[model samples]
Target: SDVFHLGLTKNDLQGAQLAIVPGDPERVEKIAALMDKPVKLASHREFTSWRAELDGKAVIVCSTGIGGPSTSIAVEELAQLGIRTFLRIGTTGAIQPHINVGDVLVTTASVRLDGASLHFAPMEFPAVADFACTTALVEAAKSIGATTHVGVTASSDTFYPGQERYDTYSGRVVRRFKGSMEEWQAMGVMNYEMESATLLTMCASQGLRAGMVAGVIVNRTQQEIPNAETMKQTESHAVKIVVEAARRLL
Candidate 1:
């Protein structure tokens, strides 16, 4: 009777306390496969669900779609369903020149541009990753021998113009977005994503633990996306880090 937006109830959750959230529904099964004895759970709107075992406890692999509004819904409902820890996994564009496409980035904090986070916390409040979660992510990355960077991430509502890219519909970015990428890069912002801000803020507001790990598919400064094979390798590395990190959380 209490189905969440993921179309999932407590029974489907299988007592999962940690959730692996990706922005695309298609990635759910792949994430689940990395665990043990995974099974299909539910699919509602842009949310898809899967449940599996990790270090002897149930862990869920769920999709939150793209951007803050839907990501907010997924996190809110999962928290109500007894998920106390969340790890957001996805793909992003590297903002810093030293970073390479296919590198894994562990987000320490995100710029509060997601807008959905503003509802949970004021602009003055920072959106930061849970310390233990981030520590586990870094440890996992190191143990897995993946190329990783731990730093700030910028989460924007719009991908093109909000990121200060000139390759959009009108081929012109607004004054506010103009040269924004350069500034963030200079400030050591590692990458740009769509959901981390709200995820961190919402979790912190509810007294939960949350972290984000993303694979780099594009280097914004280069203006060229990685090849399909390279991105696949990137995602594979990131997936391993997330799964290993979830194990560490236990």
Candidate 2:
């Protein structure tokens, strides 16, 4: 009945108690590259998974693609397979000027600009990330001396018009648009991304654990420049944080 759910069976993931979820398949690969001799467990659509140990703790990493729709499916299926803890790892645009690009944003909660979360609960429902997970992520980042922000994220379907695309924001043929960085800052949301809300809300509602650690790839507050190299590094770094924190928390 589940055509697109992760093909892994219960036994296949039985040993995994923690899951590291990244937004990009390639980010998944980058994450795998950091693990301790991780074995590939499953690969489908935007999902690529690996099972490994960090500090001798059982862990798993899966890619959630982009946006909450695809992400929710990954969360649902992984939950079915017994993953009790999940962390969304990805890159984001910083809304606050002080939160520079390349910094990590540890989401305590999210603003559900993501369409997928609305299907699960009313708009009034809180999309808060589990505090236990959040505290671990922040502590891990601090231990590594990584620049980080603890705040809310806005997850939306449209990368372009959804956030408020503009020319002075300065781009041509842009596929996603973000609202004014100033406006986002006013609401106290530190960053913007696609899947944080879905991961947080669904996991919380189901009595599972979820949190987010996003790399700040672009600071719309200051400039519109995109850095492929730095963004990749941020993704890799964030994954390490998630993997390590999950191991400790579990």
Candidate 3:
């Protein structure tokens, strides 16, 4: 059956069991560039897909645009196409000062602040990455000699207010927004991104496995910004780590 939103059939995916999902369409090509014999499969709306080979295993790369709504669609439709394993590779901002640019975070769980996942499961359900997949990501990062942090991530629905970033409208911040970073820091939340909570929650509800590896592009706590060159390197590192983890898991 073809998925309505993604406009993809099972045949387009070619029975691939693993998929690497990123938040940007531009990243779909970059992630596929690392694998062997990559072929573009389909592009519809925010979803773009490709098939590639990693260490003799067939893998797919798909983009989920930038937030929970699109992310949930990709996961639900891909799961219908028989993709049992998913790894979300994307960019993140560090809430803790100790993390630096060019570092990769292998997310073990997420703070379910996003509303999309609530449509799938209740708030009492934890948003967590699969243990085996997370271990594979950690091992892959170690094997490739990449600097990695394994910890919890905060996934927000909005890039600004939802994540506590200042808004231009008021130029003012609420106590919740001002203190969110410090609170998450105290609780040991490693980074902030938009999609992991939705990915983890939806996948878990279906009894499937999901994980995330994100590049640290900004440190909100220290007000540190990554240079363009540094950003490229970190994103490349994240791609490599995710690809290696896919190979290992397969």
Number of the predicted model whose lDDT against the real structure is largest: 1
TM-score for each of the candidates:
0.96, 0.88, 0.95
Report each candidate's C-alpha RMSD, comma-separated, in the order given.
1.3, 3.6, 1.6
TM-score, prediction 2? 0.88
Write model 1 residue lDDT over 28-119, tens digit each, in one string. Answer: 99999999998988888888899999878999998989899999999988988889999998888787888988788999999987689999
Best-to-worst ranking by TM-score:
1, 3, 2
Please give the RMSD of candidate 3 to the true structure. 1.6
Query: How many pairs of residues collide in each model?
Result: 0, 9, 0
Off by over 4 Å in 3: 172-178
Q: Write the per-residue lDDT of candidate 3 for residues 1-250, one digit (tens) a residue.
A: 4886777788877668999999888899889989999999888887889999887877899999888888999999999898999999987878888998778899989998788999989999999899989998999889878788998998888777767766568766666577776788899999888898899999989999999998888886676557867578888888889998898777
Q: List the residue pairs that clash in candidate 3.
A: none
Ranking by lDDT: 1, 3, 2
Question: For model 1, where is the 10-residue window of minimal lDDT?
Answer: 1-10
Best-matching candidate per TM-score:
1
